[PDB]
Design a protein around this nucleic acid. Structure first.
Lengths: 114, 114
DNA sequence: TGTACTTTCGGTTTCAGTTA
DNA sequence: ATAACTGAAACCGAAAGTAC
């Protein structure tokens, strides 16, 4: 019904517009989400916050030129959404937050099971 | 007929028993309703939830000593009631949630207009 | 059956407390 | 010596649910 996160995230991954946001199997049931710490020198605000920024735009919580950009908050929102969502589940021991290009790994729950 | 919220809240404001629950003009068409986030250290359940608790008793949705106290649910109920009420309108740009003693500002709609 | 709320849904925001 | 991060929980609006 009123759920937007499930299809939207799937769409972003399927789009391939976000390097590192990729499927891990061909069943398209496990996927990889870039998760770089915004304090690292490796961080580029445009690319590394692009997914969080997309979600903030899509949900109407940010408008270009009008609201001050705030990547940390964009990040917190999507993290917290993924945490509460019944549609997604982190495979915490497959996440690689400790590498040069870090990422969390998520499973997509079949529609019914809850 | 069976609408209870309008008179009840007006009565609460007139009662003066809820510090911060006050009229903003002498026509008694605009009022201030305290709206503190319960996560603050400044939060005291007895005083800051007293109105939300009162609405829960009046509507029979809580009994002291029997049901576990639950101010968040108390708050949600009154908020969702005000959201749907045709008797009240938040003056969202005069509400002050960003101050040490936060409050929302409400307008009372004249009885007829809808 | 329509009204006036209430509860639930699907995320959002804030907190105290970590971690980079 | 501080920005960013975090899970937990309070919070939110929309809208489905429901007691008259």
């Amino acid at each position: 019904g009123n759920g937007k996160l499930r299809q939207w995230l799937i769409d972003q991954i399927d789009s391939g517009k976000y390097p590192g946001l990729v499927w891990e199997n061909e069943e398209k049931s496990i996927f990889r989400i870039p998760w770089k710490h915004a304090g690292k020198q490796d961080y580029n605000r445009e690319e590394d916050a692009a997914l969080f920024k997309a979600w903030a735009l899509f949900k109407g919580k940010f408008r270009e030129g009008i609201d001050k950009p705030d990547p940390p908050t964009w990040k917190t929102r999507l993290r917290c959404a993924l945490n509460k969502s019944n549609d997604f589940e982190e495979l915490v021991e497959r996440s690689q937050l400790d590498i040069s290009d870090p990422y969390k790994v998520y499973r997509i729950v079949p529609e019914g099971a809850k």
